[PDB]
Design a protein around this ligand. Structure first.
Ligand code: HEM
Ligand SMILES: CN1CCC[C@H]1c1cccnc1
Length: 465
């Protein structure tokens, strides 16, 4: 029965609203940690949350006490559509079934294997083609990168990749993009505290709902399409494998394989498989143009190990320590999902002499692990040396946790690291990156930080080398 972690006294309903700047949630919670310690209690409106800061607090909970911290908490904006259904927002039995099935089915369509390495190499080549065809003109790379990324997971879950022509495609991409931005604003973070009121009020949360509805309707139309052209012995994509598994479980009335879980799971993958990698690429190029010395070492190393002729491949990894360090440092620096997705204690839990009642939400401050001064000698700088030893060979970090850790850690990690290596490598093989402004003027502080870290709007050009 010990005590909850210390933290500032909340008000009825508003919680710790007075100590929170919803524009800068992460900076807010970190200011509070400086006063209360690395483990503290915050009230996000009426949501009682335990916040974990620094590598040690986060590894201790999510790894050393893995089972106890394995429950899924809420993200309220996403909840509006998912409603506890689908792999990401589910718990207990639902969670174990959808994750085990999702991981396996991803692996059946080539994730972690030559299959998807081919699909990514191919789709990369299509990206090179498009950036050439701009002929060095000053463009917004946003939808160039995200079309390419989205087409990879799209081929896995929908079968065939989207034609760049498709107007529905861009529409979906705008939708995904506007949701990531919304959830990263003051208002999206205010919604995390006050959703039981705000869901019924007018404002930018109404528009973010319409985008979620947009994505749900598109997935439900693709499912429909898949069902009535289905072939039970030869699955065409993820949706088919879940349709089939649905059919096998018409006997079991306690099954988790029904329509709503298929829709929401496919939506999770589509969304998860698109926006984070895409935001990482986009920040990544921005960082590279700001650090032209880094771009030159990368260029130097691409030329010696790969040269201009062949397609980069995943194994090149092993022989490119400086590129792996660059991509590691883009992820670390980007901090794209700075507060993870919320966890929940699965039962009454003891954790460092605090007591956590069953159901308490947990915030793993992944951003604080990526910036932990005990693991990286210059947290606020972009410096690939963070992941290099004395001998310029790749150096692992225990604080490299952009995908989180523990039992509900990101299972798209393997796909992502593959897409990131290949897309970054192939793009810089063919282009030098040319900024709109001089390196000293490039602003890499974020536009929005909340659920995600969003880079500022920018333009650039892609010049042949
Ligand atoms: C830059 C790439 C990515 C980053 C930084 C990232 C980040 C994260 C984080 C921080 C979590 C929460 C894990 C936890 O609760 O401990 C998560 C979960 C998840 N991710 Fe990713 N992710 C990425 C890519 C992907 C991709 C490509 C997919 C699609 C295949 C994907 C699908 C998912 C799913 C389905 C979950 C829910 C895990 C569960 O509840 O069991 N992610 N991700
Ligand atoms: C933000 N994401 C990256 C991995 C999980 C994914 C996500 C988050 C919220 C809803 N669906 C998918």
């Amino acid at each position: 029965k010990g005590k909850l972690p210390p933290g500032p006294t909340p008000l009825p309903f508003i919680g710790n609203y007075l100590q929170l700047n919803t524009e800068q949630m992460y900076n807010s919670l970190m200011k509070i940690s400086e006063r209360y310690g690395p483990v503290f209690t915050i009230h996000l409106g009426p949501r009682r949350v335990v916040v974990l800061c620094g590598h040690d607090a986060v590894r201790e909970a999510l790894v050393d006490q893995a089972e106890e911290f394995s429950g899924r908490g809420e993200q309220a904006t996403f909840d509006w559509v998912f409603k506890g259904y689908g792999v990401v927002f589910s718990n207990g039995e639902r969670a174990k079934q959808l994750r085990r099935f999702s991981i396996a089915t991803l692996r059946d369509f080539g994730v972690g294997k030559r299959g998807i390495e081919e699909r990514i190499q191919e789709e990369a080549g299509f990206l090179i083609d498009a950036l050439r065809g701009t002929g060095g003109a000053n463009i917004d790379p946003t939808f160039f990168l995200s079309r390419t990324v989205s087409n990879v997971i799209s081929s896995i879950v929908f079968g065939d990749r989207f034609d760049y022509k498709d107007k529905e495609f861009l529409s979906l991409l705008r939708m995904m993009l506007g949701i990531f931005q919304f959830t990263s604003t003051s208002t999206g973070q205010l919604y995390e505290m006050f959703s039981s009121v705000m869901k019924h009020l007018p404002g930018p949360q109404q528009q973010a709902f319409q985008l979620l509805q947009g994505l749900e309707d598109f997935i439900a139309k693709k499912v429909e399409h898949n069902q009535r052209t289905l072939d039970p012995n030869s699955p065409r994509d993820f949706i088919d494998s879940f349709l089939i598994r649905m059919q096998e479980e018409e006997k079991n009335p306690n099954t988790e394989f029904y329509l709503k879980n298929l829709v929401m799971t496919t939506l999770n993958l589509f969304i998860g498989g698109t926006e984070t990698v895409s935001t990482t690429l986009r920040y990544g190029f921005l960082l590279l143009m700001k650090h032209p010395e880094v771009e030159a070492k990368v260029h130097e190393e691409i030329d010696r190990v790969i040269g201009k002729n062949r397609q980069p491949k995943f194994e090149d990894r092993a022989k490119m320590p400086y590129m792996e360090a660059v991509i590691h440092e883009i992820q670390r620096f980007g901090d794209v999902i700075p507060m993870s997705l919320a966890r929940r204690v699965k039962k009454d839990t003891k954790f460092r002499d605090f007591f956590l009642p069953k159901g308490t939400e947990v915030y793993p401050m992944l951003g604080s692990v990526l910036r932990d001064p005990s693991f990286f000698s210059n947290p606020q700088d972009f410096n690939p040396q963070h992941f290099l030893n004395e001998k310029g060979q790749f150096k692992k970090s225990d604080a490299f946790v952009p995908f989180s850790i523990g039992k509900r850690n990101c299972f798209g990690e393997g796909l992502a690291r593959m897409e990131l290596f290949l897309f970054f490598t192939t793009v810089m093989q063919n282009f030098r990156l040319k900024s709109s402004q001089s390196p000293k003027d490039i602003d890499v502080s974020p536009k929005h930080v909340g659920f995600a870290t969003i880079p500022r709007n920018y333009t650039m050009s892609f010049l042949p080398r």
